[PDB]
Amino acid sequence: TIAEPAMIAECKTRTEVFEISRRLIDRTNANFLVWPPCVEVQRCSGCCNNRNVQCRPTQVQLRPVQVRKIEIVRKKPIFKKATVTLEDHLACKCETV
Amino acid sequence: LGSLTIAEPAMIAECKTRTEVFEISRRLIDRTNANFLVWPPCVEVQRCSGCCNNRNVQCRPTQVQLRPVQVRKIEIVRKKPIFKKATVTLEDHLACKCETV
Amino acid sequence: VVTPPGPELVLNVSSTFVLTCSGSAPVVWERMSQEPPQEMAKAQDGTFSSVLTLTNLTGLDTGEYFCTHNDDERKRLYIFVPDPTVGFLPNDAEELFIFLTEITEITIPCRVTDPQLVVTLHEKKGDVALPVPYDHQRGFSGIFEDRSYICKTTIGDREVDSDAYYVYRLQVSSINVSVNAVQTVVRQGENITLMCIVIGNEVVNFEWTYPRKESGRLVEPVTDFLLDMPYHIRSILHIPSAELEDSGTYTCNVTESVNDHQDEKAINITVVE
Amino acid sequence: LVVTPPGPELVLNVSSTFVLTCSGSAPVVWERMSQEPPQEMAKAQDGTFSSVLTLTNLTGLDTGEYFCTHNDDERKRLYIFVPDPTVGFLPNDAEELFIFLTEITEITIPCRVTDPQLVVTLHEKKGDVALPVPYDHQRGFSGIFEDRSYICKTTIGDREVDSDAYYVYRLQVSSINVSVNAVQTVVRQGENITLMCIVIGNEVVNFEWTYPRKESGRLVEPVTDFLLDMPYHIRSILHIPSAELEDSGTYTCNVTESVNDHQDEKAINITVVE
Ligand SMILES: *[C@@H]1O[C@H](CO)[C@@H](O)[C@H](O)[C@H]1NC(C)=O
Numbered sequence: 155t156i157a158e159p160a161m162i163a164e165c166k167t168r169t170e171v172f173e174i175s176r177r178l179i180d181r182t183n184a185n186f187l188v189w190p191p192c193v194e195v196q197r198c199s200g201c202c203n204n205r206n207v208q209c210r211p212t213q214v215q216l217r218p219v220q221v222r223k224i225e226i227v228r229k230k231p232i233f234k235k236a237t238v239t240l241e242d243h244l245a246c247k248c249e250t251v
Numbered sequence: 252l253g254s255l256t257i258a259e260p261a262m263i264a265e266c267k268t269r270t271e272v273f274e275i276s277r278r279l280i281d282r283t284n285a286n287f288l289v290w291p292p293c294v295e296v297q298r299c300s301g302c303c304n305n306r307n308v309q310c311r312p313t314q315v316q317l318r319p320v321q322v323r324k325i326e327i328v329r330k331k332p333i334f335k336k337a338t339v340t341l342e343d344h345l346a347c348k349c350e351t352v
Numbered sequence: 353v354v355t356p357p358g359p360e361l362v363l364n365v366s367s368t369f370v371l372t373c374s375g376s377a378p379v380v381w382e383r384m385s386q387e388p389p390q391e392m393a394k395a396q397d398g399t400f401s402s403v404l405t406l407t408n409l410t411g412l413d414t415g416e417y418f419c420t421h422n423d424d425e426r427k428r429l430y431i432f433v434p435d436p437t438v439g440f441l442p443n444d445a446e447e448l449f450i451f452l453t454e455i456t457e458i459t460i461p462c463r464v465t466d467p468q469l470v471v472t473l474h475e476k477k478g479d480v481a482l483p484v485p486y487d488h489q490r491g492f493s494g495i496f497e498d499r500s501y502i503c504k505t506t507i508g509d510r511e512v513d514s515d516a517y518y519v520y521r522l523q524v525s526s527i528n529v530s531v532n533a534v535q536t537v538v539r540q541g542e543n544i545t546l547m548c549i550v551i552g553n554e555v556v557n558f559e560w561t562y563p564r565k566e567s568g569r570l571v572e573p574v575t576d577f578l579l580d581m582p583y584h585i586r587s588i589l590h591i592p593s594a595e596l597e598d599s600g601t602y603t604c605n606v607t608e609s610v611n612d613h614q615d616e617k618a619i620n621i622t623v624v625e
Numbered sequence: 626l627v628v629t630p631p632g633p634e635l636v637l638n639v640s641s642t643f644v645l646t647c648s649g650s651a652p653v654v655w656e657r658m659s660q661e662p663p664q665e666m667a668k669a670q671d672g673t674f675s676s677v678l679t680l681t682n683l684t685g686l687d688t689g690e691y692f693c694t695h696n697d698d699e700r701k702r703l704y705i706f707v708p709d710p711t712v713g714f715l716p717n718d719a720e721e722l723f724i725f726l727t728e729i730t731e732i733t734i735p736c737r738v739t740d741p742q743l744v745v746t747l748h749e750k751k752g753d754v755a756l757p758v759p760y761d762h763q764r765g766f767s768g769i770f771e772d773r774s775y776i777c778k779t780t781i782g783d784r785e786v787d788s789d790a791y792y793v794y795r796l797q798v799s800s801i802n803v804s805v806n807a808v809q810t811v812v813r814q815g816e817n818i819t820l821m822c823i824v825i826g827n828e829v830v831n832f833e834w835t836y837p838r839k840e841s842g843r844l845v846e847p848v849t850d851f852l853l854d855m856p857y858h859i860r861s862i863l864h865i866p867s868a869e870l871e872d873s874g875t876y877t878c879n880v881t882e883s884v885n886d887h888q889d890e891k892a893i894n895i896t897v898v899e
């Protein structure tokens with residue numbers, strides 16, 4: 155093994171994990187579950203030269219996806235459909251901030 | 252514009268490795284002073300992520316690799332750079348699996 | 353009640369077949385909870401019968417066929433229509449998720465059309481086959497961990513993988529409520545924040561009973577999860593601009609519908625001028 | 626007084642040979658890349674001095690500045706272009722790749738090629754649109770930029786060629802004014818001692834701690850930290866556990882930033898008791 159030169163992680167979109175919390179489905183009670191518990195999303199990441207610049211999305215897209223709200227009732231559960239808004243980044247740039 | 256709605260069922264993020272970003276801080280390279288810059292500021296590292304279908308099941312690395320890479324301590328003198336080398340080892344994950352807890 | 357002949361039938365593709373079923377009282381067949389094209393007929397000797405012709409047999413037909421007693425005791429037949437253009441009998445998404453209230457035997461309902469097919473059970477991303485018994489009529493039955501599984505078979509000469517199933521065992525236990533408040537004595541026009549915390553159950557119901565409830569705009573509680581392994585679910589009740597009368601009994605009644613364990617803790621909060 | 630036969634910008638064919646001449650009333654020399662190359666110096670009976678360098682087997686890398694000066698700020702510069710397909714952008718030192726600035730000004734991305742007829746464009750490292758920046762085949766692109774990385778592009782032969790990436794970086798700079806304190810000015814034997822030095826305004830600074838336990842006696846390594854990253858807030862903490870005596874005395878934090886050499890210091894007295 156040779157220690158290669160480190161390469162900067164460029165400012166660009168990369169796949170991350172987004173948690174579909176119950177909070178975003180119903181913040182009033184806790185009598186349910188949501189499935190799946192997490193999904194993938196594209197998000198700007200990487201770094202810039204300085205702190206006077208920041209890696210920020212140049213274009214974002216909000217899209218609806220269907221999740222399952224699972225309420226239980228006597229050993230049998232109640233399945234229900236629910237839509238959650240996912241945000242993806244399509245492109246980025248180091249933005250002077 | 253618009254189109255006929257096609258429901259998109261959410262898909263679970265699988266426990267697997269994805270590229271994450273590690274910030275290489277000055278404190279990391281040398282916490283005894285602050286007369287240098289670190290280059291590059293960040294690097295890509297493969298890491299395990301995603302959810303297991305359950306809270307008492309966790310996504311965990313099964314193969315880990317310590318990969319060293321060389322960065323630079325850049326001192327600035329009268330606005331002229333002096334380049335010194337440093338080595339930082341990255342902790343890559345090459346594989347994962349859901350593990351009951 | 354009787355049928356010709358029973359109990360398990362293996363038929364050829366696109367071929368034809370007739371199933372009969374008679375009993376002293378009226379009779380009817382039902383495939384998938386809904387009765388298909390039948391032909392009921394009453395015998396002069398006080399015998400009712402029912403027949404249903406299965407034309408153009410296709411794998412998708414493979415399944416349970418019953419014979420009841422209408423316009424708990426019946427006779428089920430299982431029919432296999434070996435169709436190489438059909439891998440695993442497609443099934444509902446509600447079937448793909450297996451939620452459980454306790455530790456018990458489980459069945460992964462992945463079925464084939466040909467009884468002579470070798471079906472193996474695997475973890476979604478796994479190659480080795482698992483030592484679980486298979487019943488071509490019901491699938492794999494055994495004990496599992498909360499993970500995802502798929503079945504595999506060899507139709508023709510190509511390996512086929514059914515969908516993925518997900519086991520999920522709910523988190524249940526005894527219920528104990530722990531109520532508190534930022535301060536049981538608040539001044540008029542200030543904030544009334546109470547926090548009801550319960551740990552052990554994943555899905556719990558929260559019900560707040562208080563003074564400013566009946567005949568008056570109620571409050572919306574806000575739940576939150578502390579930890580996720582040993583479920584620490586917290587429900588807080590916040591009342592900004594504390595008017596009077598708010599002084600009184602504030603009780604948080606927590607119940608889990610999985611079973612039905614209940615519990616309730618109360619505190620008294622006074623408001624001063 | 627200095628003259629070169631002939632001057633000023635040359636474009637020479639690969640592998641050829643060229644002779645440049647420089648003369649003046651006092652000694653004279655040719656310098657390429659900061660170091661005077663193989664010359665043949667001489668003097669004239671009329672009191673004239675001269676130097677002639679023989680460029681042999683010209684290659685693209687011979688592209689660049691050549692100066693004629695007076696030694697054993699007034700000089701004569703010649704720019705020589707040696708078009709050479711085997712060469713893309715002229716290679717430059719890691720120091721030229723980082724462009725550190727202390728104020729807002731014009732900037733030059735020094736990406737240069739060997740052929741003056743080559744087309745060259747400026748791009749944000751990852752970016753396809755050519756930036757509208759004037760170019761000078763001798764020097765590179767000059768304009769105003771933000772703190773990003775840039776590459777230059779050119780087509781040599783038929784292939785697109787990319788330069789190394791250049792990084793524009795404006796350091797955060799300002800006056801220095803130290804602020805020091807201690808967890809407690811009066812400590813007891815065997816206990817910990819800890820002081821803090823915080824300077825704000827500069828991204829890079831040198832912290833210097835002078836204290837009792839220093840001369841003749843293992844010194845202490847401070848630990849630096851960054852509180853706030855926008856206006857740079859840097860903190861240095863000197864920690865001495867198991868405080869022995871003698872530790873009592875003056876403790877100082879001298880802080881200097883090397884970019885403009887500003888300095889500042891604050892002293893505080895700590896006394897240890899038994
Ligand atoms: C044959 O199978 C097709 C496909 O299900 C069906 O539509 C048709 O009714 C069947 N009977 C025939 C032979 O027409």
Ligand SMILES: *[C@@H]1O[C@H](CO)[C@@H](O)[C@H](O)[C@H]1NC(C)=O
Pocket residue numbers: 377378420421422423424
């Ligand atoms: C009709 O079907 C129901 C289904 O449970 C059964 O209980 C009932 O006995 C049937 N009617 C007759 C023939 O009694």
Ligand SMILES: *[C@@H]1O[C@H](CO)[C@@H](O)[C@H](O)[C@H]1NC(C)=O
Pocket residue numbers: 526527528529615
């Ligand atoms: C809940 O736990 C408390 C102790 O913290 C106990 O006193 C109470 O009886 C429990 N609730 C019930 C009745 O299950």
Ligand SMILES: *[C@@H]1O[C@H](CO)[C@@H](O)[C@H](O)[C@H]1NC(C)=O
Pocket residue numbers: 599600601602618619620
């Ligand atoms: C709280 O005080 C009220 C008086 O307004 C009383 O009715 C109630 O019983 C108290 N809460 C309980 C049940 O402990």
Ligand SMILES: *[C@@H]1O[C@H](CO)[C@@H](O)[C@H](O)[C@H]1NC(C)=O
Pocket residue numbers: 559561605606607613614615616
């Ligand atoms: C809990 O909330 C109130 C308290 O009396 C009541 O209306 C409700 O039925 C209780 N839940 C149960 C049945 O455990």
Ligand SMILES: *[C@@H]1O[C@H](CO)[C@@H](O)[C@H](O)[C@H]1NC(C)=O
Pocket residue numbers: 682
């Ligand atoms: C020109 O000089 C270079 C470098 O010494 C050499 O590689 C090349 O062979 C020379 N040209 C000739 C005459 O072959």
Ligand SMILES: *[C@@H]1O[C@H](CO)[C@@H](O)[C@H](O)[C@H]1NC(C)=O
Pocket residue numbers: 800801802803
């Ligand atoms: C540092 O701050 C102090 C005021 O708190 C003052 O000396 C000056 O404004 C700053 N820099 C200096 C030493 O001029």
Ligand SMILES: *[C@@H]1O[C@H](CO)[C@@H](O)[C@H](O)[C@H]1NC(C)=O
Pocket residue numbers: 833879880881888890
């Ligand atoms: C810091 O240390 C002392 C304190 O003034 C003095 O030598 C000078 O100011 C600084 N030393 C250096 C290396 O600049």
Ligand SMILES: *[C@H]1O[C@H](CO)[C@@H](O)[C@H](O)[C@H]1NC(C)=O
Pocket residue numbers: 364367368
């Ligand atoms: C199975 O029986 C059918 C008669 O219904 C006929 O097509 C043939 O004998 C067999 N078909 C196969 C599987 O070759």
Ligand SMILES: *[C@H]1O[C@H](CO)[C@@H](O)[C@H](O)[C@H]1NC(C)=O
Pocket residue numbers: 542543592
């Ligand atoms: C009540 O709590 C404090 C009171 O100072 C403050 O957060 C606000 O006034 C109220 N809560 C909120 C943020 O609504």
Ligand SMILES: *[C@H]1O[C@H](CO)[C@@H](O)[C@H](O)[C@H]1NC(C)=O
Pocket residue numbers: 651652694695696697698
């Ligand atoms: C040669 O250059 C240096 C300055 O760089 C200085 O000695 C003087 O300018 C020149 N010497 C002569 C011959 O005047």
Ligand SMILES: *[C@H]1O[C@H](CO)[C@@H](O)[C@H](O)[C@H]1NC(C)=O
Pocket residue numbers: 817866867
């Ligand atoms: C420093 O001394 C030791 C460890 O260095 C320990 O007591 C603590 O971390 C510090 N002293 C205290 C209690 O402030």
Ligand SMILES: *[C@H]1O[C@H](CO)[C@@H](O)[C@H](O)[C@H]1NC(C)=O
Pocket residue numbers: 874875876892893894
């Ligand atoms: C530290 O404080 C003492 C007073 O106890 C003073 O004499 C000394 O000059 C101070 N340190 C310095 C050198 O500023």
